[PDB]
Amino acid sequence: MLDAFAKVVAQADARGEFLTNAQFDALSNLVKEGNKRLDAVNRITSNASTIVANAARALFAEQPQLIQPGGNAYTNRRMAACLRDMEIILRYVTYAILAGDSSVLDDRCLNGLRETYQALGTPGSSVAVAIQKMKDAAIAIANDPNGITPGDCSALMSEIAGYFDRAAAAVA
């Protein structure tokens, strides 16, 4: 898996090149923005249980067919597996946020996932909905101005939103 830094190194090696001044500058900014990234990861992770459970509750309220008998989210085993998947996705998204690159998410989580849901009969569009709910919650929690040194984290929130959208795209 790669991280924002290894990503750049990997591109450079493919060309056989040393880093340019421009690339050092970019990467120095990444390091300068690091504290914000650690806060985001901390905050989302610190609230992982509520993010998931509130997103699940909201999903089943909007799509009660999922929990009606004969559904996919019906029975405790299927419910458990569903909640689990939401936990798993949130988990890999947080990895991605730490790394500043999606390769861990893509690789270890997202690839083959559509085909997997298609084989099981799990509606991907519903999973995407759950992901979007977690996204809105994760971002509100991560970007909450209370209890933290004020500054602008907007760029990072957009990046974060990007990982969530990416995950939702992968299944929808």
């Binding site: 190194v9 050092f24 990467l27 690091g34 988990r91 947080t94 790394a99």
Partner: protein
Amino acid sequence: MKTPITEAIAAADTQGRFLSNTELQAVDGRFKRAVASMEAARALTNNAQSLIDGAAQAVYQKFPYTTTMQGSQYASTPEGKAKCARDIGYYLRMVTYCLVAGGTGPMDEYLIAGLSEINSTFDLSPSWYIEALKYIKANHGLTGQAAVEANAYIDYAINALS
């Protein structure tokens, strides 16, 4: 690729866990250390040509048979000399990657894996590259923690060649 960040994630993911302070602290150390690593990477990049040129001659100096013995493994021909300097450049460039990435990953992946096989197959002495690396270490002109960073990855290569 092995970096402080990917090692932190790998540790969490191995156990099916979300990331904890136990891991965010590691990454913070990486972010703090990056100031010294990036100084080093920049200086080594900016001075790469003179380092490579100097390093090549340091080798030829210590092992003059490399400039005279017949053989495609030796630097006794223009093409051989060009390959030697290329290789030294490779080493130096990998050091700079290690510094940028904050870990051994790039060198491990691009250079160390396969190294003994390649050296034995093409009849290249590890001792040649060690001398080159010792020159770079001696003459990189870094001081303080920037030098500690550069030397950690240079010595890592030396250890891989021993």
